[PDB]
Each structure stands twice: as C-alpha cells, then as structure tokens.
Amino acid sequence: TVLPFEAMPQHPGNRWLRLLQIWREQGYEHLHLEMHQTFQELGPIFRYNLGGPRMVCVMLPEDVEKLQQVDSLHPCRMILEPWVAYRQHRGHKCGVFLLNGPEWRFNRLRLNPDVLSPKAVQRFLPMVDAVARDFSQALKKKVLQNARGSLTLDVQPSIFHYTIEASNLALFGERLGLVGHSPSSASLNFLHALEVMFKSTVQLMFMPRSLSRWISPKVWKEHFEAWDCIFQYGDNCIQKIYQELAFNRPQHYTGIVAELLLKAELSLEAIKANSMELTAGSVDTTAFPLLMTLFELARNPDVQQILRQESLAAAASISEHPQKATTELPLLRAALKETLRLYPVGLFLERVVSSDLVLQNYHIPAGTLVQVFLYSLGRNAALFPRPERYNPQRWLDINFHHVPFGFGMRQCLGRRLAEAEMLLLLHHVLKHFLVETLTQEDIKMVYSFILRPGTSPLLTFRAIN
Amino acid sequence: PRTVLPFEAMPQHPGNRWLRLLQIWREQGYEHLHLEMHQTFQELGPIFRYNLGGPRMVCVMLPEDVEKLQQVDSLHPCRMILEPWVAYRQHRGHKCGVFLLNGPEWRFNRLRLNPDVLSPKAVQRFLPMVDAVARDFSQALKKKVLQNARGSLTLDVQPSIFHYTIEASNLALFGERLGLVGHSPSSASLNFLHALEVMFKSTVQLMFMPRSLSRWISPKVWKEHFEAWDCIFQYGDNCIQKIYQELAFNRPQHYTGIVAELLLKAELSLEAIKANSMELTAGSVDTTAFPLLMTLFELARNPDVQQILRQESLAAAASISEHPQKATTELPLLRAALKETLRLYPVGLFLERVVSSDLVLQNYHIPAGTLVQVFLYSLGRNAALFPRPERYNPQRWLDIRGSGRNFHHVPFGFGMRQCLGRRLAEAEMLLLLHHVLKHFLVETLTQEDIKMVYSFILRPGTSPLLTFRAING
Amino acid sequence: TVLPFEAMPQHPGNRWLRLLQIWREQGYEHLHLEMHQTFQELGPIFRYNLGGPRMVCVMLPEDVEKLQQVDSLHPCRMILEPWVAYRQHRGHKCGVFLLNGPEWRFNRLRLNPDVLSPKAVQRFLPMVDAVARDFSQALKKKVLQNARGSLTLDVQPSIFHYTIEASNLALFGERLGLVGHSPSSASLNFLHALEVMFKSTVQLMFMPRSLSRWISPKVWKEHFEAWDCIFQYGDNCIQKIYQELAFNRPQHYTGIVAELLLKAELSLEAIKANSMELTAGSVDTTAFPLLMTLFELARNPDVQQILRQESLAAAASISEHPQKATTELPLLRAALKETLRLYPVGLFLERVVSSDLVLQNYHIPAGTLVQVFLYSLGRNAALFPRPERYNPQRWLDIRNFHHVPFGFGMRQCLGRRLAEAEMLLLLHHVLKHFLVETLTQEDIKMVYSFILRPGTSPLLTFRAIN
Ligand code: HEC
Ligand code: HEC
Ligand code: HEC
Ligand SMILES: C[C@@H](NS(C)(=O)=O)c1cncc(N2C(=O)c3ccc(Cl)cc3C2(C)C)c1
Ligand SMILES: C[C@@H](NS(C)(=O)=O)c1cncc(N2C(=O)c3ccc(Cl)cc3C2(C)C)c1
Ligand SMILES: C[C@@H](NS(C)(=O)=O)c1cncc(N2C(=O)c3ccc(Cl)cc3C2(C)C)c1
C-alpha cells in the first residue's frame, strides 16, 4: 500500500537557518555534500520543510523514470526569480530555460532542429573540430619550445577560451581569435561577469524578493551589474550577425543563430533571448567537465592509454570526416559519461510535478517540487560498483543511469554541442600529448549554481613525438 | 550704389559672453556650438555680430564673404591667439608652431615648411609611403574578414582608422613604421589619443574666458589641460629625439619622411623644427581620422554612390598599383566624395581672421582688427549654395570647373594660412578608401544621421557598426 | 713596524646620521660617490665607526691579495639580516649567498659542477646562443620596417627580457617567449618585485632589526611583500621542472636545475633555495653591464669597429660551435672586463675576516669587516692609466688581482660563467648585424640600490649594417 507524503523522512534542518548561513557565508559551497550526507542518513528519498510547499529529494534513476512519465506537455521548473527579475526590469523576453508552459514549448520546438537535432550537429561539428585542432596545435608549438618537450600549466584559462571560441563559431560562425592567443579584455570580463552572476544567484535564490530586497540589496545590484556585462557581450554577438544577414542571406551554413534568424519562426526578441542563453550557457558548462576529464586522465594513466589507442586508430577517419568522431570514439564518449557521473555541473534536476505520482512508494502530490541530486545518484555503489573508480568501461558493459543533461523534452538544449566540443578537444589532445600530474589528491567540488572544482591542478602535457 | 551700413547696424547675437562661460562651466563643454550658430544664422541672416563687451566679432556663412576675407588677407594673416595652448609653450619653454604663430615669425616658419609638407613635389615623395600603410590596412582587414564564415567582419572602425592615421602620419613625417596597423594598439598610442581628447575638451573649457577668469573659476581645468599637453609632448619629443639621433650619424640619400627633410635642410632652428614637428604629429591624428569615418558611414548609407566610386577605384586599380601618386589624378569621384564629406561634416567648423584692414561684408562695414568667423557647418548646409544639401552627392563637385564655385570648398581654409597638412590628409583619406573599395563592401543598418559634437574639432557623437563584406573571398 | 687599527684615518660621518639620511631619502643612491670621495680625501684605507664593530674600507688590488690569504676553508660575509628574516619567517632554507661556514661549503661544492664548471658551460652555452640569436633577429625585423633601416630606442626593457629568457632556458630549459614578443605580466611584476626588494634592502640594511622594526615597519612589509612575488615566480619555475622530471628523467641536457634535481646530492629544500638565488640573481646582474657595454660602444665607435671586425671573422666558427665564442672572442671578453671595471654591479666585495691580517701597514684584527670598493678600485689612475678611457686592449698586454668584479676565491660569483656567456653572445650577435650609435656622449650617473645600476637609460640607435 502507497504511503502518504507525510510518512517520508524529513530533512533535519530548516529554511531559516539555511537562509542565515547563506547570508553569512555569501554562498552554499557545500550544498552537494550536505544533501549527500542527508541521503546517507535518511534513505534515497526525503522531504524538505519549506513551511508550506512540498519539496522532495531523490537520487535514484528509477525515480527519474517515474518523473519523466509525469513530465506532461509542459514540464515545469521553479521560477528562477532573480534571473526573471533582470529580464522584467530591462524589458527582455525569456529564453527557453526561464520559460514555462506553452511559451516554453513554442520556443523549444523552434530551437531543437537547429541547436540539438543530429542534422544540425552534422553541420556545426566540422566547425568545432577546426577550433579543437587549433587548440592542440597552439599547445604543441609551446610544448616543443621547452627542452623536455612538455609544458606544465593550469589548463583552465585555455579550456575556457576554447569553449568561448568553439561555441561562438558554432552559434554565430565567427572566429574570435582566443584559441592560441592572449585572452581578450571582453572575454575575461565576460567570464568574470558569469562567475559573479552565478555567485549572486545562490545568494538571492534561497529567499523571497520580499526579504532579499532589504536583507541583501547590495547583492541585487551586484547581480544586475553582472547581467549588464553578460547582455552587453551577448547583444554585440547578435547585432553583428543580424546586420550581416540583413545585407546578404548566405548559401552555406554559418552557425546555429544564423539558421534561427533566416527561418524567422521566432520573433527577433525571442531569438535574442535564446541566443543569450546559448552564448552564456555554453562557457562554464562545457569547460568544467573538460578540466575534470583532463585531471581524471592524468590521475588514471591506464584509462588514458586505452582512450589514446582508440583516438589514434580512428584518427584518420575523423580527419577525413569530423562528424565520425561521435560514432568512432565510443570509449571517449563513455569517459565523458564517467566525468559527468562523478562531477555533474548540473547538481540537481528540478520539476514542479504537473500531476500526482508515486516515488519510492510515497504519494507525491501535484505541484510538489522534486529535485534529483546527481552527485549522490552517481556516487551510489549499488548502481555503480566501486563508484570512486574512474572507469569508462562501465558504460559499455551496461536506462536513466546517465542523466547529466536532464531528461525528456526539457533535456539540455546544448547537450549535443557540449558533447561535440568535449569529444573533439580530447581526441586532438590524446593524439599528440600525454597528460600527467603529481596531484593525486581528489579535487574538492564547490556549489556556485554550477558544480565547479574548487582548485585547478598543475597538468603536464608531454609531446608523444 | 546703396549705402554701406555701419558695424553697429548688424544683427546682434541674442546671448552674451558671461552666460556662455557660465554654461561652459556647468556643462564642462560647448558640444552644441555648431547647432547654436546655425540656428542664429537661420534667425538673423547670413551675417551677425557677437557681443564680446569691447572687441568686434562678426560671423559669416557665405563663400562670397570668404572671397572678400582673402582680399584683406595681408602678407601676415593673423588669427586669434589661442591663449591656453600658448600658455603651455611659454610655461615649458617651447617655441610656437605655425598654427600658434602670427606675423613675421609665422611667415618665416610657413615658407620653410610649405615645400616639404604641402608642395606637390613633397606629395610625390610621401604618397608611396602612405599607400603602403593603406594597403596594410585592407590586407589586415581581409585576413580578419576571411576567418569568419559569412566572409565579412562587423565592427566599430573608429579604433582601426585612428591607428591608421597615427601609422600613416608617422611614416610620412618620420619614416618609421609603428606597427599599429594590423596589430593590438600600443599603450603609448592609446594614451596619446586619450591625451588629445582631454586637451581638446579642456581647450573649449578655457578658451571662452580670459586668464583672469579661468584662473579661479576653473583652475582644475588648467591643470587637466597642461597634464594632457605633457603626454602629447612626451609622445612628440620621443619621435623627434629618434630622427634627430638617426640623421646625426648618417644623412640618407633617399626620402625618409617630411621631418627628415626639414632637419637636413636646417633652414629652421631645432627648436622651430621641434615646435612644427609637434603640430604635425598631433595635428594629423584626429583631423584625418574623423572625416575618413564619416566617408565610410556615408558610403554605407549611399550604396549607389559607393558602387560608382568602387567602379572608378577598380578601373584605376592597376595604374595606382604601378604608381601610387596617380591616385590624386585618376580618382576624381573619390576626391569629390571627400569634398562632400567635409561639406556636411567639417572637422574645422570655423575659420578665424583678426582682419588687418577695413572691409565690407554683406553691405556692412567691418573695421580693422575685427575678428571674423566663417561657420563651415552653416555654409555647407545652405540649400542655395548646395541644392538638396542633405543629399550626399560627389557629382556636385565635378562639372563646376569654371562655374565660380571656387570658394564653396574651403574646409582646409584659404590663402597662405590654408591648412599645412591639407595634401597629406587628402592622401591618407584617398588611399585608405581606394584600397577598401577594391576589396570590401561597406554596409550598415544605422541609416539615421550621426549627431556631431563640438570639442574643438567637430567629431561624431557616436561611431556606427559597419560591416565589411569581402567582394572576392 | 706595523701600525695599530686606531691609527687608520676614520670616515668623517657616523652610524646615526647615515641611518637618518637613509630614513629621509628612502635610499643611499650616492653611496659609491660618497666612498670614492672619502678615498680621495683620506687615502686607500680608512675605518668606519660602527660604535663597536671594526669596519675597514680598501680600494687596492694588493689589499685584495692579502684578503685572499686570510680566506679560510669557509670565507665569511656579513649576515644579510632582512633577506635571512624572510626565509626564517616563511620557513625556507638559505641559498649559497646567504649561507656561511660548513653549510655554505656543502651547498657550494654541489653547485659548482653544474652552474660554474667549464663542462657545464659547454652544455648551457648553445642554449644561451639560441636566445642571443632570437634577440638580434627580432631587432633586425623591427629595424628593417623603418625607412632609415635603423631603430632608435631604450634597450633596457629588451635587455631585461633577454636576461630573463636566457637564464630561464639555462636553468630550467624552458622558453618563456619573452624575446621578440610583448612582455608578460609575470615578467614585469617579477622585475618590479626585484626593484622594490633591492630598494627596501638598502633601507633596512644600515640599521639593526631592533631599530628598523619601529623606525621603518612599513619598509619591512614592502620588503616581504616584494619577496613574496619573487618566491611566487621562483616556486612556479621549480614546481614545473620537479613535476616534469618526476614522470621522465631525460637523456639529454635540459638545464642546470634539472641536473641538480637528478643528482639529488642536495635536499629538495636546498635545491629550491639555490634555484631561487639563481633565478632572481641572474636578471639584474647580467642586464646592467650588458646595457652599459652597449652604451660605451656607441660612444666608443673606434673600439666598436675593432670588436665587430673580430666578431665578423669568428662569426662562422661560432655559428658551427657556439662554445667557441669563449675562446675566439678575446677582445669582446676584454670589453666586458672594462665595462665591469667602470660599472661594477657588485660595488663592494665583503669578508668578515677569520684571522688577524695587515693591510696598508695597518693591523686588521680577526672579526673585522673588510669592504673592497670596486668603483674606486677600477677608477684608480695609477693602476688604470687614463681610467675614464674605455679601452679593452689594456686587458691584453699583461704584466694579477686587477679584475675582481665577480669576487675572489671559493666564494667568487657562482653565476660568473653564465653571466659572461649571456653577455658575450648577445653582443656578438648584435655586432654582426648592427651599428650601435648615440648622441648622449655625457657620462650616465650611477645609482646605488643594492646593485650599481645606471640612473638613466640612453637612447641607442641600431643601424642595420647592410
Ligand atoms: C644567478 C646567476 C648569477 C649571475 C648571472 C650573477 N651572479 Fe654574482 N653571484 C651569484 C651567487 C649565487 C653568488 C654567491 C656565491 C657565494 O657567496 O658562495 C654570487 C656572488 C657574487 C659576488 C660576491 C663574490 C665574493 O667573492 O664575495 C660578486 C662580486 C658577484 N656575484 C658579482 C657578479 C657580477 C659582477 C655579475 C654580472 C656581471 C654577477 N655576479 C652575475 C649568482 C649570480
Ligand atoms: C548551448 C548551450 C548549452 C550548453 C553548452 C550546455 N547547456 Fe545545458 N542547457 C542549456 C539550455 C538552454 C537549457 C535549458 C533546457 C530547457 O529549459 O528546455 C539547458 C538545460 C540543462 C539541464 C536541465 C534540463 C532538464 O531536463 O532539467 C541540464 C541538467 C543541463 N543543461 C546540463 C548541461 C551539462 C551537464 C552541460 C555540459 C557538460 C550543459 N548543460 C551544456 C544550454 C546549454
Ligand atoms: C599634418 C597635420 C595636419 C593635418 C592632417 C590636418 N591639418 Fe589642418 N592645419 C594644420 C596646420 C599646421 C595648420 C595651421 C596652418 C597655419 O595657419 O599657418 C592647419 C590649419 C588648418 C585650418 C585653418 C586655415 C585658415 O585659413 O585659417 C583648417 C580649416 C584646417 N587646418 C582644416 C583641416 C582639415 C579639414 C583636415 C583634415 C580633415 C586637416 N586640417 C588636417 C595641420 C594639419
Ligand atoms: C550547470 C547547469 N545548471 S542547471 C542544474 O540549472 O541546469 C546548466 C546547464 N546548461 C546550461 C546552463 N546555463 C548557463 O550556464 C547559463 C548562463 C547564462 C544564462 Cl542567461 C543561461 C544559462 C543556462 C541556464 C542555459 C546551466
Ligand atoms: C580642429 C581643426 N580645425 S581648426 C580651424 O580649429 O584648426 C584642425 C585642423 N587642422 C589641424 C588641426 N590641429 C590639431 O588637431 C592639433 C593638435 C595639437 C596641436 Cl599642438 C596642433 C594641432 C593642429 C592645430 C595642427 C586642427
Ligand atoms: C650585484 C651583486 N651584489 S653583491 C656583490 O652584493 O652580491 C650580485 C652579484 N651576483 C648575484 C647577486 N644576487 C642578486 O642579484 C639576487 C637577487 C635575488 C636573490 Cl634571492 C639573490 C640574489 C643574489 C645575491 C644571488 C648580486
């Protein structure tokens, strides 16, 4: 017999002590570890006391399957009040992430063919590969200047300028000149603006506008000033492509955003909104799991040689046809699944369930907030034997086990672009370099809206030839 | 004939010197000056007198009045003493350049400068150098353009155009490649450009009131002005110290710039060469730079005109490639397009002359010693002088040869005191545009008129987003 | 008959007025000229009143000779209290410069074979030559873009980025990409940190910690903040090479520091300490005599053509084998001896005498601090006929302790042969392609900021020869 909602284990804490500790610490850096500990202590399902609303936390793929069933025509997410507040203030339309209901479905169906569809990936994958090549060849040049034919560095800046370049070329069809050169003032300010926006989000996110208004008004300024820079960067991108297309409609493929603009299925204000989400949403999301793959490969050399052997065999066919990298690199794809399992940028999946459902034999009423904690999900030994072990082979021996890009209609729009940028950088890196590190210690993870590593390790890149 | 009316019979400007300075104190500038004077001409006629509470000041806007002004232009045409600029030079112990000199000292400097800066023989010598930089500008742009999928680059051209005018001028004056065209701007270049911007801003603030007033009303502006000049002179002295040392050890056979010829001739003192060299180094940046941009804008706005100029530049492309000095003669339309850009958008704004002997302008008696200002903005926008004045049409300057319109094109002034860098500016402007027209299509969605700002120079308020589409690719 | 210590003429000034003038001026820029004037007024030997300790000042090679014989198995220098204070505070070991006694000798003997030995010079010389070439070819490129086929500039920044690049490649075997490109934020901050550290040394150097701690505490902060930047730069260099070697021990030569790490004769903390002294101690030291040689050559065109003729004849053999530059450039080597004679970056040699000695017929007791002022020594009209005249040929006649800019004995400069290599090769490659010229014929004023550096940098023209 199905147990009532109230029968479920309750989180020991409270929404006020959480609020005050956030005001204090100016963040919630250990949210992932807090929830992971709660799951260890209470079970794979528990309810958070919001003093009225219903909030459930899950960590099982069987529970994600049940959630997808309830999804409905319009899967609902929680309204991200601080973000929506900026758009309302400056008079901008919302992108597909911040949209809900029919307006969301209208935007999404017009976006999927150009951003996510396999036909679209066939078109922008050769562009991504071009930037991926330029990354390794720039590195190789620097590596060969040193006597020991290797360069030791913090790869993070390079990886970020790669994700900026690769995304810009995929969206707008413009080479920014970031890969292989000194970072732009515009790029650094953009990267900093995102970092601040994400930090301030957490600060304003866990309390109503009515409270945060007077408790933290300085944070609201910080947040909006940060968005002002993100939008300044984004609008510059759109103003360029909109003028270029206005005078000449090209024959060939010149990016995702060009497609959207040419089709004119969405309004300019809708294209502007979604273009913003894609320009800013492609930077930190792709670059952090890439840094974590490079680290884990430098940590697990045995895995690195297996992936290198694969990348060297398939090297020739990928050189002739880049779009073959998706199919001819099954282990490298599996390594990325493993990086996202242990290090999810998207700590939790979120749905304000549209109808009643039953999770772990507990009644979950309609309107209930359901959060799928990916950190805990990926770290349960029952479903991932030896979960601490970085093993891509586990994804080849074996269904909702791999949900880092979400699920259903609402699943990550930039999923296939991110995978493409990640696969191709790594394929080109494995082909020429050996990634090595003395930092064998686990990198601590920090919650700043995105689950980012706290520290960047020193990585050696030894030239194979 | 009809009775010549006295000076006092002339319409008087409604405002006053005191309120004007109070406004400039408040606003920290006179950005609307051109529009203020243009409105005054609409309301009072083509001649009016400004009350300076003692001195005689007349304002004109007709070419017929410019003709009468040159008649009075003596052996030594003299202008108003630019007190703030002069003040810096006497404080730091520098000689004055032509622009700041008057009388015999001016004529002595001017006659020794004209053969190497302005003469056609000098233009034949520095033109191939300018063309070399003009080529490098387009080829650097083409490289950037071809990296993008749509084979076009959309940008604010202003920074590029400024680094072109700095590079082109430096190569023409000192025979040195600064490496600005096609590369990241220098800290020196950016600080120099900023220093000029500040100097021009502070000029407007101090030049509308006596030293007796500005010393207490705005002493902070005097500091701001001199600190700005300190940077301009630091840049300028570096240029001259280099060429002076280079020539001291080896006198070259070939042409290596304007300033090299002045130094080799030694007709002027080192302090006179230093003074004039400064005026030419700083005076060649913002001047050539703003009309060149307004041309790019107007062409992006007038595609019909652009294709006519491109067709011309493509036909003459081969002969200009063989001999760059042919660009002056073989590009008559592109030359007239520049006349049209300066007609609408004069970087000058006005021409001063503190008249040497009595004259009559618009049937009014203009006594000796009267300051006369020719407002070029108003002159160029006059519908009776230029039919459909808002229309950008280079063809209006072509079959006017022996039609009396000799005084309609006066953006570089007139007479002996006419702009010294006239022919260098025209060369930098023609050649950049010829090389740009040959490879790119200039396009813009910004069809709305750019507002002009008065900050000593008449500069655009905003810089538009311009697309440069590769014609070939 | 030998004269007592007290019989020696005494410096007119005092410990306290010195201290206060350094407090007021925030430096002792004129020290060299002060001591040089004192020698002119008092003789070639005088004593400084420290109000207890014995301090003697000398300027004759005969006195250096006598100092060498008193040099024990462990020659002593004065403990540089501010520097030692940083290492003690942050828990770092001391390098061979800051060490004394047996600990010094232990470090020294394990350093000499890889840093100073001729066998080591044969290994790092081709690396230095590679950077020296890149310097001239980068210059040539810029020179040829100008109409008069010459570039006029302040060479100082370029020369500094050369010493940084050349030293880094020699020590760690890493190309920093400084030569021929825009200076790094890291390099500029490093150069600035050194400048500050040296300035703040002079300020804290002439008074005890007991006093400097309250009379100038702000200076102690700026000194340590400066060292923090120097150590941040240095530690990155080490952390890179230590990780690189941990995964693969190379077959070929990949720098000085690599050979020390591979030998493991010294502890990692000892290698770190000495590696820091070599990384920071090779920037300013090589740069200033290099910049001064360029200056003296532009004002001595006659000398320049002699050195150029030599460098052009030997050009081919040096191209085939760079290590031949040491032997096949005797005049260029002699020009460097002349640059250091008039422009000693050292300024004064120092020894805390281990046993009694007699200098200039005066009794010098054990424990007495003896300072050899190289500026005055090199400007002595009686041993250097027409001392103000720049003449490399005076080092070739030979009739001997006249050339002591790298010190003397076991304690003689560890980076002597690396500095000479960087200096010779830059100049050889510059002489081969350019003519150095200047209108600045007037002597550059020298400044004392721990190192003897030129106060002003002159404008130097580099005319392409063909
Ligand atoms: C890092 C490379 C390095 C370079 C380059 C360098 N030095 Fe040194 N130098 C040292 C070190 C280390 C010592 C300390 C040796 C000791 O006390 O055992 C030293 C010590 C000295 C001493 C003290 C010697 C004594 O007998 O007391 C003098 C003098 C000296 N250097 C002069 C120079 C001069 C002059 C130059 C360049 C023209 C130079 N050094 C360049 C590393 C360097
Ligand atoms: C191209 C930009 C872009 C990139 C790159 C990107 N995302 Fe997304 N992502 C989005 C957008 C837009 C949405 C919102 C999808 C929606 O609301 O329909 C989204 C949503 C998501 C969601 C939530 C969807 C759901 O079912 O709730 C997850 C999880 C996610 N992304 C994970 C990732 C991960 C993991 C990466 C990188 C490894 C990543 N994203 C890279 C654009 C991007
Ligand atoms: C090479 C430097 C230089 C450049 C470039 C330059 N000028 Fe000049 N200009 C001068 C100098 C010098 C004078 C002063 C000549 C004199 O009055 O003796 C001057 C004077 C003038 C005068 C005053 C003439 C009079 O009769 O009162 C005008 C108008 C003028 N310039 C317009 C321009 C315009 C328009 C441009 C380009 C768009 C320009 N100048 C570019 C150097 C320059
Ligand atoms: C890490 C994960 N978080 S989560 C769990 O909430 O989906 C995530 C996944 N995909 C995309 C993102 N985006 C960003 O980075 C970003 C920046 C600026 C804007 Cl305007 C929009 C975005 C989005 C939300 C699209 C974020
Ligand atoms: C403003 C415009 N018209 S006007 C009629 O007012 O001179 C103009 C036209 N031609 C040349 C210039 N110069 C400058 O820009 C400049 C900068 C610094 C100095 Cl030291 C000297 C100058 C000059 C006056 C040469 C200015
Ligand atoms: C100029 C001369 N002065 S002297 C004669 O008093 O030693 C000298 C000669 N050789 C080397 C140096 N060094 C430096 O420059 C330096 C910088 C930073 C550090 Cl951590 C260590 C050093 C040393 C002392 C090695 C200084």
CSV table of N, CA and C in Angstrom, one decimal, chain B residues 174-177 241-246 248-250 254 256, chain C residues 145-148 150-152 437-440 459-461 463:
chain,number,residue,atom,x,y,z
B,174,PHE,N,58.2,61.0,-40.1
B,174,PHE,CA,59.5,60.4,-39.6
B,174,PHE,C,60.0,59.2,-40.4
B,175,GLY,N,59.2,58.6,-41.2
B,175,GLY,CA,59.7,57.4,-42.0
B,175,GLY,C,59.9,56.2,-41.1
B,176,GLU,N,59.0,56.1,-40.1
B,176,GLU,CA,59.0,54.9,-39.1
B,176,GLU,C,57.7,54.2,-39.1
B,177,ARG,N,57.8,52.9,-39.2
B,177,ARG,CA,56.6,52.0,-39.1
B,177,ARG,C,56.5,51.7,-37.6
B,241,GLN,N,63.5,63.0,-31.0
B,241,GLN,CA,64.8,62.6,-30.4
B,241,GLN,C,65.3,61.4,-31.2
B,242,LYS,N,64.5,60.5,-31.7
B,242,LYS,CA,64.8,59.3,-32.5
B,242,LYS,C,65.4,59.8,-33.9
B,243,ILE,N,64.6,60.6,-34.7
B,243,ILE,CA,65.0,61.0,-36.0
B,243,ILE,C,66.3,62.0,-36.0
B,244,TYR,N,66.4,62.8,-34.9
B,244,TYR,CA,67.5,63.7,-34.7
B,244,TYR,C,68.8,63.0,-34.5
B,245,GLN,N,68.7,61.8,-33.7
B,245,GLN,CA,69.9,61.0,-33.5
B,245,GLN,C,70.3,60.2,-34.8
B,246,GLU,N,69.3,59.6,-35.4
B,246,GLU,CA,69.4,58.8,-36.7
B,246,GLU,C,70.1,59.6,-37.8
B,248,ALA,N,71.9,62.5,-37.3
B,248,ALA,CA,73.2,63.0,-36.8
B,248,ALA,C,74.3,62.1,-37.2
B,249,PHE,N,74.1,60.7,-37.3
B,249,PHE,CA,75.1,59.7,-37.6
B,249,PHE,C,75.2,59.4,-39.1
B,250,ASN,N,74.1,59.6,-39.8
B,250,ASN,CA,74.0,59.2,-41.2
B,250,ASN,C,72.9,60.0,-41.9
B,254,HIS,N,68.1,58.7,-50.0
B,254,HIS,CA,66.7,58.6,-50.3
B,254,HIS,C,65.8,59.4,-49.3
B,256,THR,N,63.1,59.8,-46.5
B,256,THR,CA,62.8,59.1,-45.2
B,256,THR,C,61.8,59.9,-44.4
C,145,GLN,N,61.8,47.6,-41.0
C,145,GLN,CA,60.4,48.1,-41.2
C,145,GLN,C,60.5,49.7,-41.4
C,146,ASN,N,61.5,50.3,-40.7
C,146,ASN,CA,61.7,51.8,-40.8
C,146,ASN,C,62.6,52.1,-42.0
C,147,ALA,N,62.2,53.3,-42.6
C,147,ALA,CA,62.9,53.8,-43.8
C,147,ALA,C,64.4,54.0,-43.7
C,148,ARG,N,64.9,54.5,-42.6
C,148,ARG,CA,66.4,54.7,-42.5
C,148,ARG,C,67.1,53.5,-42.0
C,150,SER,N,67.1,51.6,-39.4
C,150,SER,CA,67.6,51.7,-38.1
C,150,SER,C,66.5,51.9,-37.1
C,151,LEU,N,66.6,51.4,-35.9
C,151,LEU,CA,65.7,51.6,-34.8
C,151,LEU,C,66.3,52.3,-33.6
C,152,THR,N,65.8,53.4,-33.1
C,152,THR,CA,66.3,54.2,-32.0
C,152,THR,C,65.3,53.9,-30.8
C,437,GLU,N,74.8,53.4,-32.0
C,437,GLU,CA,75.2,54.8,-32.1
C,437,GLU,C,74.4,55.6,-31.0
C,438,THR,N,75.0,56.7,-30.5
C,438,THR,CA,74.3,57.6,-29.6
C,438,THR,C,74.8,59.1,-29.6
C,439,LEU,N,73.9,60.1,-29.5
C,439,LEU,CA,74.3,61.5,-29.3
C,439,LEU,C,74.6,61.8,-27.8
C,440,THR,N,74.1,60.9,-26.9
C,440,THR,CA,74.3,61.1,-25.5
C,440,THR,C,75.8,60.7,-25.2
C,459,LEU,N,69.2,56.7,-25.2
C,459,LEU,CA,68.5,56.4,-26.4
C,459,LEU,C,69.6,55.9,-27.4
C,460,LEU,N,69.5,54.6,-27.8
C,460,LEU,CA,70.5,54.0,-28.6
C,460,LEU,C,70.0,53.6,-30.0
C,461,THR,N,70.7,54.0,-31.0
C,461,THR,CA,70.3,53.7,-32.4
C,461,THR,C,71.0,52.4,-32.8
C,463,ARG,N,71.7,50.7,-36.2
C,463,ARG,CA,71.6,50.8,-37.7
C,463,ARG,C,72.0,49.4,-38.3
